[PDB]
Design a protein around this motif. Sequence first.
Motif, mmCIF file in Angstrom:
data_model
loop_
_atom_site.group_PDB
_atom_site.id
_atom_site.type_symbol
_atom_site.label_atom_id
_atom_site.label_comp_id
_atom_site.label_asym_id
_atom_site.label_seq_id
_atom_site.Cartn_x
_atom_site.Cartn_y
_atom_site.Cartn_z
ATOM 1 N N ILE A 1 43.028 37.044 45.490
ATOM 2 C CA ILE A 1 43.885 36.864 44.320
ATOM 3 C C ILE A 1 44.137 35.382 44.082
ATOM 4 O O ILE A 1 44.098 34.902 42.943
ATOM 5 N N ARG A 2 44.408 34.634 45.153
ATOM 6 C CA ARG A 2 44.646 33.200 45.011
ATOM 7 C C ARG A 2 43.359 32.457 44.664
ATOM 8 O O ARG A 2 43.378 31.509 43.871
ATOM 9 N N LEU A 3 42.234 32.874 45.250
ATOM 10 C CA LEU A 3 40.956 32.241 44.942
ATOM 11 C C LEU A 3 40.586 32.420 43.478
ATOM 12 O O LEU A 3 39.862 31.590 42.916
ATOM 13 N N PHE A 4 41.067 33.492 42.844
ATOM 14 C CA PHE A 4 40.866 33.646 41.407
ATOM 15 C C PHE A 4 41.332 32.421 40.630
ATOM 16 O O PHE A 4 40.870 32.198 39.506
ATOM 17 N N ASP A 5 42.235 31.627 41.200
ATOM 18 C CA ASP A 5 42.681 30.389 40.571
ATOM 19 C C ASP A 5 41.497 29.485 40.249
ATOM 20 O O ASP A 5 40.988 28.777 41.119
#
Lengths: 132, 133, 101, 128, 509, 37, 72, 195, 304
Positions: E224-228
């Motif tokens: 979810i954070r890597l989606f950044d």
Amino acid sequence: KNRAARVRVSKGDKPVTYEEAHAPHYIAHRKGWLSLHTGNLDGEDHAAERTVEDVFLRKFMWGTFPGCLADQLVLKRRGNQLEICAVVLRQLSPHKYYFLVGYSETLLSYFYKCPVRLHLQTVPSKVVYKYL
Amino acid sequence: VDVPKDLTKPVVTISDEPDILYKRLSVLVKGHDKAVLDSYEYFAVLAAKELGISIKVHEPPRKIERFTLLQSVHIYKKHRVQYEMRTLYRCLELEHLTGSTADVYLEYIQRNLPEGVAMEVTKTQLEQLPEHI
Amino acid sequence: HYVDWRMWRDVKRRKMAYEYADERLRINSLRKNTILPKILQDVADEEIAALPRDSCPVRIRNRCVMTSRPRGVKRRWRLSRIVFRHLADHGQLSGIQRATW
Amino acid sequence: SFFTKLTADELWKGALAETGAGAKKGRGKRTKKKKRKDLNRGQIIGEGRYGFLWPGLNVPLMKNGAVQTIAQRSKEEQEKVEADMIQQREEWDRKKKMKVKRERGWSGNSWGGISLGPPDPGPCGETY
Amino acid sequence: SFLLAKKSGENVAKFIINSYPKYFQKDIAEPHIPCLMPEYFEPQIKDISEAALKERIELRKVKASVDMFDQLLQAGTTVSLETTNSLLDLLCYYGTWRAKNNAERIFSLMPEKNEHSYCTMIRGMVKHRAYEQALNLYTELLNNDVYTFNALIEATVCEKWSKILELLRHMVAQKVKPNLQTFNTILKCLRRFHVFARSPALQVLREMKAIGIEPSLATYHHIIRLFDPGDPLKRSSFIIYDIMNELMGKRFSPKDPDDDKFFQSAMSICSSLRDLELAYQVHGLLKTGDNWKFIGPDQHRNFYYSKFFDLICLMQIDVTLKWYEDLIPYFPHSQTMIHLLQALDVANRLEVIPKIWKDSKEYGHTFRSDLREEILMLMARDKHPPELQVAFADCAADIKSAYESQPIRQTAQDWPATSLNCIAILFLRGRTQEAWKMLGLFRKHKIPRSELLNELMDSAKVSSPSQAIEVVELASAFSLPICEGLTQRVMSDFAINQEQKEALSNLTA
Amino acid sequence: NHHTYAELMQTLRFLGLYRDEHQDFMDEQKRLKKLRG
Amino acid sequence: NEAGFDDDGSEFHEHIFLEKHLESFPKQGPIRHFMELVTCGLSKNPYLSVKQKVEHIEWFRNYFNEKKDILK
Amino acid sequence: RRKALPPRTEKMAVDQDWPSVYPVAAPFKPSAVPLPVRMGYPVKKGVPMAKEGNLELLKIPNFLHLTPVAIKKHCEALKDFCTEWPAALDSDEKCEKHFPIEIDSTDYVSSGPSVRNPRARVVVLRVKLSSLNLDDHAKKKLIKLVGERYCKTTDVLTIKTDRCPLRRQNYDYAVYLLTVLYHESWNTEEWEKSK
Amino acid sequence: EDFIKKQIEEFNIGKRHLANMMGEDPETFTQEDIDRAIAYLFPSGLFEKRARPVMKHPEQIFPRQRAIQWGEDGRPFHYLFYTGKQSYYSLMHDVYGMLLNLEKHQRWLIKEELEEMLVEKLSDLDYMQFIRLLEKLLTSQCGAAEEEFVQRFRRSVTLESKKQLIEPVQYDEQGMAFSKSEGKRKTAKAEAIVYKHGSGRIKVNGIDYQLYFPITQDREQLMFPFHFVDRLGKHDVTCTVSGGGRSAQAGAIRLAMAKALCSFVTEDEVEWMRQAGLLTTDPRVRERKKPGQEGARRKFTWKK
RNA sequence: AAGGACCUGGCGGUGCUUCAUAUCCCUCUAGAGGAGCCUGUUCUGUAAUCGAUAAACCCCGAUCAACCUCACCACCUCUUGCUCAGCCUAUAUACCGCCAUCUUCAGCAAACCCUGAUGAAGGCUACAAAGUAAGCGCAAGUACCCACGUAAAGACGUUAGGUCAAGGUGUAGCCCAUGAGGUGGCAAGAAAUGGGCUACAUUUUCUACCCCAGAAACGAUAGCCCUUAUGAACUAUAAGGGUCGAAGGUGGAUUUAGC
Ligand SMILES: [Mg+2]
Ligand SMILES: [Mg+2]
Ligand SMILES: [Mg+2]
Ligand SMILES: [Mg+2]
Ligand SMILES: [Mg+2]
Ligand SMILES: [Mg+2]
Ligand SMILES: [Mg+2]
Ligand SMILES: [Mg+2]
Ligand SMILES: [Mg+2]
Ligand SMILES: [Mg+2]
């Protein structure tokens, strides 16, 4: 003329609190007991231990919070758990207040091997019952 | 607005053994204050009635013990000072009370004690006969 | 740091009596028993006589804890009458009223 | 013993003897007077023989945005603090005990030529 | 500061008890409790066997150095292979010239070293020192565990397409069957990458679900954070919304120690995405069960509450403000109050700002005028409620009381030049002498303004020829715009009073 | 034991946390006596 | 009032019945009389456990066995 | 220098979760308590002491916690856990028929760190022989053996066990004592036959 | 002065809070409810209500104080303020005006009561003066408003009954009437059931009096109630007693017998029995022994 | 310095009036100074505590001393001595803390005003003439069975009242001692006095019951011997048994307690 837990009547410039103003024969009539335990009741034991230990509690806490208190303490022992209640002034900083609170609680718990808690009520100036 | 969604309930297990049958739970509260004793017994009887068990309330007499002390220090035999320790009793009986009901009720009350009170439980449970007889 | 040297001696006597309590009980039974040989009774008698000093539970005294006052001390509270009156007046202890009946 | 110890004011009373037999009848005593003193007000509750540095009460708890840790005051620093406290107590005692110079009027030990200042302002308000 | 001082006092008490046990040695309490008993980190007399056994009890390294010395120099024997493995465990956990010395002294041991010893050496050299050493140790191991190969994998990692590929392939090939913590670590290392590993992360997670081990507690949030992110991805946002909705619906069980970043970075993604249903679901997440331990650090809790209330404000706002008035408990930072005031401005609820400012002042709002300026501007952009002008004057007086605290800081000097205009207008709007003399002080400190001209004009017309002149003519002689206003003011009745001040006006004009 | 009690309070005074008024009184009068000989 | 302090899983018969502990003397003698009264008192006493009771018994054993010179 | 914020009196609303703000036993905390309740001997032309410095309300026991609402709430909460008593048992005679052997122990609870007290060991038990013996010879034998442990008015035999410190040990010894007593009353002897 | 209204509104808020606490609709709520709630939530063993915890309304907490009797400037409002006792002065003036008005036309109130009614103290002398003026006004006729003015101060007499309680008769098997009563003593307590239809022998715990009281004074005391009423052998009585002393039990039985007979016998005869004085529990008990005394009243001999 | 006149208190074997509650009596009862015993005090001697030692101590510190309790004394030891020493060494005429006393009282009073020529001092006239009063105490209320009663309480101050020996402390001393440790006895009466118990009688003494009886015409809680309770220690501490079976015949002034 008996001299027992009473302050001499002065010209009227001596602020005095409720408990130390009232006489020791008015304790059960117009006061409450500072401590509350069952060692005094029948069937219990170690009443001498209770008395000595609570006197030591009061002494140690009065001398480890010197100059901040302005009245006697309130002890409340429910089974195992011990509770203390104090009335202090806003003399020193909340930093020191909390530090000494935690320090004393930890030391007393370690010493008496018993769960202990203590609370403090801040007052700007000590409440006076009358000027004697 | 903050009302929790899923209440976390503690685990419970009905073991293979049957629960013990207490015939009578008779508790005796010793105190120093009639008002404190009245508040505590009202608490207890209200909890018991809301849990759905029988109740009954009695009031034994007040016991007092006094002993004389010398009012002064060195030489005074005529003048003494006296004291009195007053203990007040209150009885509460519960009949036809299951073992687990006793457990929950005693846990509740034993956590809900006040300080200046002593509490004496007398538990009466019936059982069947032995096998060796 | 006991109150005084008499309290020191009293505590020494109490500790000695405790640590020789069971043995003194046993040999006192062996003495005061009658059906056994009187020669054995006398043996136990000189045994007790040779036991060290400050060992008997009779030499100790129920002294006070605070003021070290031997007389006027309650066995229940262990406090002198004066200190008891002091604490009762200051309301330090619990559940004590004046007998004004 | 520690159990024998007790609060300060009763010791001060027993030592000063403010209201014994001597004070009554006006007999007094031969010009000796024990002056009141308070030791709790003087020293802060932190320092002692063992000079542990307390971030809670003795040292500021936060320095450079970093919590502190219990440490030791060396021997030389402890002795310096002791000498500073000695000097402070000496200064306090000096400031306490000093001369009093009420203007000599008609003569010494006489209340003739001394003034008490202007009157006290009245209740309704009257400055004199 | 307060609760960390509490913890420091707890540590202090620990120090006193472990420095003087004999005082707390008596067992007064009936139930014996070792937590209440004093702790004794005291080495006993010299005895190599029980001393080596106590090595694992004391938890330090000087004892271990001394024991290795005593066993190597004169003894030359091994008390136990398990004892040597425990010594190596401690030395690798404690590890930097000191770590270098420890690593070079882990080669003076006897040849009795097995998979356990080699793999713990690898663990230590990974999590405390360079990675080439761990790689050489693993090559030696091959020439001759889950967390061990984990350390090796993150050491190799910390572009490397072939390396990642062969690593994953042969790791899955071996019969280790990790608990996916290796996958979690390689995700931590893959914190940043483009789609060519962001999207393959989804199929790797699908394989995780197929094998059925992970609760999807840490790797899911990390992807979810890597989606950044240049453009928000609403499709992926809705997919992950559904996924974490099912996560919230099911009850949670903690397994990964890195669940603290979960909360904070999750709310960061919440502030990025900016969705009300997303906020509802992320609140239900921690509000479902005993999961509120994952908040933990005050910094993460602060970030969470800040972004939460920010999104709630920037979503009527009556529900939001009552939620806040119920659930303030600590006093939040200015940022949240700024967003609160913006929400109150867009909502037009004028009567609420006094209470919020009073709450902030009561708690911690002192010695900063950003929020004061914001409140003043937003409240005197209004003048609609006439009966509320009393509250205007009151809160203005309270703001000025807060201002006037002490000059030593010099910060209160520039506050009147910025926001005294609205304050004095509010004071003007019942009692007005305070506003008159306050504008006097302001100009007698100036930075005139058109709103200040309007203030002066309305004050003059509501107010007495000489009383108005002694202000307007003076400010006119001071600056020119008050003079262009005085040209109009002097028409009605001001001119006929006295001529010297009119002459001064003519001269200055 | 007064042993434990007084030793604890003495060590804690040496730490410098418990302002013992009785001990301060005592040591002050002892300082005065040793100054006066 | 017994959560803990189980007396090492001791038993009522181990406390009270000392007949198995009493084997090295006949059932009529004065040593038998004294040791029977000792066992009675020990069983009556709940404060002490089987360990202290056997300590009493073995100390009496040593006593009269090192004073076995009489047996009168 | 530092200032104290005003109490929670104005902050607390009339609609409020008192069981939630006072879950467990705690002091009075007048700053948090909005009630102006005062307690103290009033002075001539005076009134009792305000709740601010009224340490006597703290001296007295405390019961602000566990309001009637809290008691109700906790009772409905623990209603899920409590069990039901057998409906067949609704009388003393029926209970004594179903389970004749009555047994009861007792113990105090008191404020303090220690919890043991020897009175925990005692346990009494009761059984009437009107229905248990089923014979006359052993009846007369055992009633001759027991001196005062019986009661012929109410028809109950009662025996106490405290010889062991443990309650379970006393229980086991009491049951074994009853067993051996029945086994030794079953038989007889020649001096008992000759009377 | 504003503090009064502050306390009033805060007390109302606290009353609403306490209503929500104890779980009742805060509108209908009463002083007895307040008292029970405070007694349950904060018990206290203090004996005096002065010291016990009390949640009272501020109007009744604070005593009445005379408000500012003169304006912000100039003269005072009342026309006696320059002298103390102004309200009583005006009252005496009005009473004297009414007295002279009636002249041309042609229980009591406690001192402390008047003290708290007014806002100033006074003396026994002018109190007696006021009482004298009242009685002088009342000696003569009194108009309606005058009578109402006097009754404003005059209070209720609160007269007692001056009568001995009458126990109700009771009926039991075989349609048998009777009456039960109870009596006490220093340390003896008894209960006696008087049977009217029966007569003759008397039972005492299942034993007759002739051999239960070897001495005859006890039987004479038992006869005294029947003797005074003059009905001797027309009523029987059973009785159960628990006491230490023989004369104590005798007096207890006598009191119980009289308390059971007053029910059957007419009220006039009950009044005659009360005049005889056998229907009141003896309040006398053995005095306490004192610590310094040799006995209850005797002291050690004066040694000089 | 003497002296004259005055202010306040005490005193009067000081006048008038009203009182005395068990206090003064006349009165009512029961007792102390008769004999024995228990327990204090004075006194004799011992190496052998101490203090109070009129009212307001004398079964007082002591609701305990066979050994610690022991603080006295003979003998023998320790010298930083459990004490970041210790001292029952002096000072109760430094004191705190704790109490007797009038008190079986009701006055004590900050702060204002007034009178006396602005003196010490006083301030009371109710059909009223300068007194007003914070506050304390009393009182009220609280405890027991009440509202009465008993308990409780009883201020300002006198006796430099008792207590440095409940405990601490100011000052002065010992600080190889005047401190500390371990063995012993010390603790009896040629004598006087005090408080209590016993009986000196037939209301007594014995026998079963606690009150309908039958007999005698009593009195050892001292001494000798023995048994028992605990103690390590019973010559003797306590209780019991056998013997001894007197003094004593109801008090020499006076005096004590009681509604
Ligand atoms: Mg007295
Ligand atoms: Mg003894
Ligand atoms: Mg000169
Ligand atoms: Mg002795
Ligand atoms: Mg000496
Ligand atoms: Mg004196
Ligand atoms: Mg009174
Ligand atoms: Mg009294
Ligand atoms: Mg004197
Ligand atoms: Mg003996």
